[PDB]
């Protein structure tokens, strides 16, 4: 039927069909378009109190809850999808990862290098596609596949 991870769903507000990816947590109205040894991605990380290291260049002691971090992630996704903000600009300003200084870019990587939920989402994304919230032990991520 559909590319890997994608399933059809029903909107509760509008009653129209949409599409959801259970590997990337991406969702969209239109039927998705459609594996390499390597992909290239950028990300925006929002850390919280249960993160492996509750610290970042933005905050010596990160105290926000997991629920608060998810709300921030959802808000960044909204601004990116509406075009009020670009992914790289939000990543440079607000990602709790050191890669913020490189507009979130992590470079190219293979399977077996990143944390598993991050890796699975990255390889399920198409070039140019962005994930929904992805949970790892670092925190909550938005991932943009660039190559």
Instruction: Kindly list the domain boundaries of the chain, sorted by start residue.
Output: 1-32, 38-147
Nearest to 41 by CA among 144, 137, 138: 144
The Cα 57–Cα 131 span in angstroms is 24
- Of 42, 43, 48, 51, which residue is the catalytic one? 43
Does residue 141 have an active-site annotation?
Answer: yes
Query: Which two three-digit tokens encode residue 89?
Result: 């600009």
Q: Is 30 left (phi over 0), alpha (psi -120 to 50) or beta?
A: beta
The structure was resolved to a resolution in Å of 1.6
Does residue 110 have an active-site annotation?
Answer: no
The Cα 139–Cα 47 span in angstroms is 5
Experimental method: X-ray
Class in CATH terms, 1-32: mainly beta
Instruction: Supply angle C-alpha 47, 38, 36, rounded to 5.
Output: 125
- b/e per residue 46-76 (b: at least 16 CB within 10 A): bbbeebeebebeeeeebebebeebbeebeeb
Taken as a whole, the chain contains a residue count of 147
CATH 3.10.50.40 fits 38-147, yes or no: yes
- Report whether 38 contacts 138 (CB < 8 A): no
Does residue 22 have an active-site annotation?
Answer: no
């Amino acid at each position: 039927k559909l590319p890997p991870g994608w399933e059809k769903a029903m909107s509760r507000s509008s009653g129209r069909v949409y599409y959801f990816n259970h590997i990337t947590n991406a969702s969209q109205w239109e039927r998705p378009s459609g594996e390499p040894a390597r992909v290239r991605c950028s990300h925006l990380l929002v850390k919280h109190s249960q993160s492996r290291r509750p610290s970042s260049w933005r905050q010596e002691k990160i105290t926000r809850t997991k629920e608060e971090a998810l709300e921030l992630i959802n808000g960044y996704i909204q601004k990116i999808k509406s075009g009020e903000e670009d992914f790289e600009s939000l990543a440079s300003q607000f990602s709790d990862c050191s890669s913020a200084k490189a507009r979130g870019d992590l470079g190219a990587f293979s399977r077996g290098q990143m944390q598993k939920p991050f890796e699975d989402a990255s390889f399920a994304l198409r070039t140019g596609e962005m994930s929904g919230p992805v949970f790892t032990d670092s925190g909550i991520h938005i991932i943009l596949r660039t190559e």
